[PDB]
Amino acid sequence: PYTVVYFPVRGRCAALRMLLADQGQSWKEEVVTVETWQEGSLKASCLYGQLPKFQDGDLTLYQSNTILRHLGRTLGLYGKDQQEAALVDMVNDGVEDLRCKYISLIYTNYEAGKDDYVKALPGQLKPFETLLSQNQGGKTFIVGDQISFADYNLLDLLLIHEVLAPGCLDAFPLLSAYVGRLSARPKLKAFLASPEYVNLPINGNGKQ
Amino acid sequence: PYTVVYFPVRGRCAALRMLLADQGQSWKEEVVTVETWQEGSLKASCLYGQLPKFQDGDLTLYQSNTILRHLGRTLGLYGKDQQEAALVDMVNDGVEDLRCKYISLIYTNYEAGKDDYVKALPGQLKPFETLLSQNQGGKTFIVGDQISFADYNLLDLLLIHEVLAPGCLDAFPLLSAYVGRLSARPKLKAFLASPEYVNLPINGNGKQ
């Protein structure tokens, strides 16, 4: 019932893929090639002229966060009540905020802005470490005592930054333990080690 | 029970303010002055070091969209089912995407990028006009037959662009009628005419 249409990269699909994997859900992948896109037909049909595009039965969605929230809402990974839902949201926006700057580094001024970015990274990771310390001492998830779509999206964000600035998680013991704890979940662990994940580039231009 | 803490501008608070007004809800405003902020005390306490900050009882939220979704979730402005909820979401992300570039124009290269931005505007407004035509012929709301937080967020976006590039909505008859229809809602109409709204600048640097 699930289908994700995206380029042959992890990018903004990595998280939602971790979500379906870990949740034990089946989905079909529809790879879009640098030519098909450029053929104009696809882009032209995409509401915002962008991928990912996702299909759920008779439902078609665009935008990564819309899909993530959708899966969370339907699969039950959106907090146990409105209050947790709002905090799950708050965490995702923050994640998205950093993802947004990350993407800007990679495709805009990688070579020339990498140093300043890594320098400014701690300042960016602190809020999530802080959020963690305020929830059962950063022992469970980022909000509540049950996993949420924001968890998968944060785990990805953390993961891709360790590749960008290895060790950047040394000074944030709660984030570090969080990455190891979630990364060890049976289905997710298997997924992240699989070729489907491991053999895909993180970004388009090959910069990481 | 509601309190919004923001600078003395409309910016990212305009929409949620329209939401509470139109919904007939009471809230208190806590203005933050260019001096308090820069004192360091506030910023330092803000999860992401940024405003708006919102309070619902002892519940504290940051990020405009988290607040908007929260109000939508608690006030019943989030679609009539999961399906509509996902589309409401999709619309807000798009709105936020254009808002994001708008803000970049205003605070980064207004004078030098204004022409290219207006030139590229139609291309940006089309998706919402298209979304409108596919819902009861753009006669009700942006999703479903009941208003949603995305409605308020889009109305604002349209409203502020009309001031940036007057007439920019003359090419979109469904968007135009949508702006006039919503702007005429009793409570909202009153609010938008009030000094509370009218006497606030749209952005920080006074560029609009």
**Strands, E assignment, A10-52:** 27-31
Q: Which residue has the tokens 């035509």?
A: B133
Residues A87 and A175 in one domain: yes
Q: CA B193 to CA A7: how far, in whole Å?
A: 47
B19 touches chain A (CB under 8 A): no
Torsion of CA B146, B147, B148, B149, to 10 degrees: -170
Residue ranges at the known binding site of B for glutathione: 6, 12, 37, 43, 50-51, 63-64
From the list B86, B127, B130, the residue facing A70 with the nearest CB is B86
Distance from CA of B127 to the nearest CA of A (A): 6
Residues B180 and B92 in one domain: yes
**What part of B 101-130 touches A (C-beta under 8 Å)?**
127, 130
Two tokens at A31?
A: 């790879």
Q: What are phi and psi of A45, to 5 degrees?
A: -85, -20
Tell me the chain A residues in contact with residue B48 when contact means C-beta distances shorter than 8 Å.
94, 97, 127
What is the domain-level CATH number for residue A150? 1.20.1050.10
What is the domain-level CATH number for residue B55? 3.40.30.10
Q: CA A203 to CA A166: how far, in whole Å?
A: 17
Q: Which residue has the tokens 């979630």?
A: A182
From the list B48, B59, B69, the residue facing A89 with the nearest CB is B69
Distance from CA of B42 to the nearest CA of A (A): 15
Two tokens at A194?
A: 């699989």
Label the pairing between strands A53-56 and A2-6: antiparallel
Contact check, Cβ <8 Å, B89/A69: yes
Tell me the chain B residues in contact with residue A97 when contact means C-beta distances shorter than 8 Å.
48
Contact check, Cβ <8 Å, B94/A127: no
Query: Measuring CA to CA, how many Å separate B181 from each of A92, B124, B189?
Result: 33, 21, 10
Distance from CA of B191 to the nearest CA of A (A): 26
Residues A88 and A142 in one domain: yes
Residues A70 and A97 in one domain: no
The three state secondary structure string of chain B is CEEEEECCCCHHHHHHHHHHHHHCCCEEEEECCHHHHCCCHHHHHCCCCCCCEEEECCEEEECHHHHHHHHHHHHCCCCCCHHHHHHHHHHHHHHHHHHHHHHHHHHHCHHHHHHHHHHHHHHHHHHHHHHHHCCHHHCCCCCCCCCCHHHHHHHHHHHHHHHHCCCCCCCCHHHHHHHHHHCCCHHHHHHHHCHHHHCCCCCCCCCC
Residues B57 and B143 in one domain: no
Instruction: Return the residue of A nearest to B47 by Cα.
Output: A127
Resolution (A): 2.5
| Structural biology method used | X-ray
Contact check, Cβ <8 Å, A63/B131: no
Residues B70 and B94 in one domain: no
Tell me the chain A residues in contact with residue B97 when contact means C-beta distances shorter than 8 Å.
48
SS3 A180: helix
Q: Are B207 and B106 spatial neighbours (Cβ–Cβ below 8 Å)?
A: yes
Instruction: Name the residue among B72, B84, B94 with its Cα closest to residue B16.
Output: B72
Residues A99 and A157 in one domain: yes
Distance from CA of A72 to the nearest CA of B (A): 11
Residue ranges at the known binding site of A: 6, 12, 37, 43, 50-51, 63-64
Mutation site, A83, A129, A135, interface B, largest B CB count within 10 A? A83
How many beta-carbon pairs under 8 angstroms link A with B?
Answer: 68
Contact check, Cβ <8 Å, B47/A90: yes
B62 touches chain A (CB under 8 A): yes
Residue A130 belongs to domain spanning: 78-185
Residues B103 and B142 in one domain: yes
Mutation site, A80, A88, A93, A153, interface B, largest B CB count within 10 A? A93
Residues B57 and B94 in one domain: no
Residues B84 and B165 in one domain: yes
Count of structural domains, chain A: 2
Q: CA A100 to CA A111: how far, in whole Å?
A: 17
**Strands, E assignment, A100-176:** none
Q: What are phi and psi of B198, to 5 degrees?
A: -55, -30
Residues B43 and B59 in one domain: yes
Residues A138 and A150 in one domain: yes
